[PDB]
Amino acid sequence: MKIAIINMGNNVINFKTVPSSETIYLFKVISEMGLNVDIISLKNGVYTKSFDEVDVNDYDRLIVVNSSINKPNLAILSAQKFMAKYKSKIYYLFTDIRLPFSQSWPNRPWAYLYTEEELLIKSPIKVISQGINLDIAKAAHKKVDNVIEFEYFPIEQYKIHMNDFQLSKPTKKTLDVIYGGSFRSGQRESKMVEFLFDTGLNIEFFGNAREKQFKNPKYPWTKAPVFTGKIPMNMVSEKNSQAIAALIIGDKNYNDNFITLRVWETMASDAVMLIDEEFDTKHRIINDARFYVNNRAELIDRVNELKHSDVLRKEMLSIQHDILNKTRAKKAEWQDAFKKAIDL
């Protein structure tokens, strides 16, 4: 059994970006399962083989991640051409709602260098949805003409199942609330302004976001949180640990559907995980109302309660860490489920 992993829209090497980093980490966790796997990208390196140095059909299973299509680039075109020659099923890891599988064929001046068939992917596609709601996954891929099927798998748990995983340790607190991520084209501007702006608390937003991006008049604010630079993925939990609490906010289509990497990065940290009620209305993450907040007013009060009671804060950290460990205890089941998902 030979497996291949390819990032459909981003070059893969080192850990200079979320897509490239997640690809290497997914590659690593799949290898740790006792599976023979290669990462195929633009160039040969310590973690990858080039498209030009391998025969796509020598692989029994082809896993694909990150579809950047929805202005094609070298990575996208090379991936498309590679997938186009593969004669078997493609297993697409749907980890970001905005990035469903799609062919660049429809998507140009440079079109002169490529032909249709050369990029037309005819293989059936199995969408492995990180989200439990498959109707949402189907809707996101409604434009796909390929034969296609769907199945749910909590892909994002690769963080906690990695062999080197460790909970964050008690850390000196210099922040009230922290959130690490990107602006994501303002798709979450309303929630970000609700929970992170004008709270009167000491809040930090780390990652790609900048204050100048929050300019939609529909979501007014007076004072913004402090924005700091991007840091390595393997430093996110340590960064979250500088704060009393770390926030998880809702997103239409993600709500009551996706559990995101952030959930685990936050749960594993020394910061109490506070969740926007709308993101998990049934409290699947933690069956404890103390970890949920409906709006800004509730977030402020909850953070103040945590600051006033070290007992409450430590108790909640103990609870979230325990819950995280209960999931880590199911590693073998998780590994078996992934294997079944890719027909092994």
Ligand X SMILES: O=c1ccn([C@@H]2O[C@H](COP(=O)(O)OP(=O)(O)O[C@H]3O[C@H](CO)[C@@H](O)[C@H](O)[C@H]3O)[C@@H](O)[C@H]2O)c(=O)[nH]1
Would you count residue 156 as binding ligand X (CB under 6 A)?
Answer: yes
CB 219, min distance to ligand X, A: 17
Judge residue 268's burial from the number of C-beta atoms within 10 Å of its C-beta, 0-12 exposed, 13-18 middle, 19 or more buried: buried
Rounded CA-CA distance 36/54 in Å is: 15
CB 17, min distance to ligand X, A: 8
- Which of 246, 225, 250 lies closest to 303 in space, CA to CA? 246
Would you count residue 233 as binding ligand X (CB under 6 A)?
Answer: yes
Q: Find the part of the chain contacting ligand X (CB under 6 A) among 133-141, 254-262, 308-316, 323-331.
A: 254-262
CB 327, min distance to ligand X, A: 15
Token duo for residue 334: 């998780």
Would you count residue 260 as binding ligand X (CB under 6 A)?
Answer: yes
Would you count residue 237 as binding ligand X (CB under 6 A)?
Answer: no
Residue in 262, 271, 291, 316 binding ligand X, rule: CB under 6 A: 262
Helix axes 310-328, 296-308, angle to 10 degrees: 110
Q: Find the part of the chain contacting ligand X (CB under 6 A) among 32-40, 107-115, 161-169, 176-184.
A: 176-184
Non-local CB neighbours of 112 within 8 Å, separated by 6+ positions = none
**Backbone dihedral region of 275: left (phi > 0), alpha (psi from -120 to 50 degrees) or beta?**
beta
CB atoms near residue 215 (< 10 Å): 9
Q: Find the part of the chain contacting ligand X (CB under 6 A) among 82-90, 230-238, 301-309, 334-342.
A: 230-238
Each residue 276-315 as x (binds ligand X by CB under 6 A) or -, in order, gives: ----------------------------------------
Non-local CB neighbours of 227 within 8 Å, separated by 6+ positions = 204, 205, 206, 209, 210, 211
CB 310, min distance to ligand X, A: 28
CB 131, min distance to ligand X, A: 8
Helix segments in 59-112, DSSP class H: 74-85
Would you count residue 130 as binding ligand X (CB under 6 A)?
Answer: yes
Would you count residue 180 as binding ligand X (CB under 6 A)?
Answer: yes
Would you count residue 258 as binding ligand X (CB under 6 A)?
Answer: yes
CB 16, min distance to ligand X, A: 10
Rounded CA-CA distance 232/25 in Å is: 13
Each residue 61-100 as x (binds ligand X by CB under 6 A) or -, in order, gives: ----------------------------------xx----
Residue 61 in 3-state DSSP?
A: strand
Residue in 230, 290, 307, 339 binding ligand X, rule: CB under 6 A: 230
Rounded CA-CA distance 291/274 in Å is: 5
Residue closer to ligand X (CB basis): 37 or 233? 233
CB 228, min distance to ligand X, A: 8
Non-local CB neighbours of 257 within 8 Å, separated by 6+ positions = 131, 132, 133, 136
Q: Which stretches of the chain bind ligand X, using CB under 6 A?
A: 18, 22, 95-96, 130, 156, 180-182, 184, 206-207, 230-231, 233, 236, 258, 260-262, 265
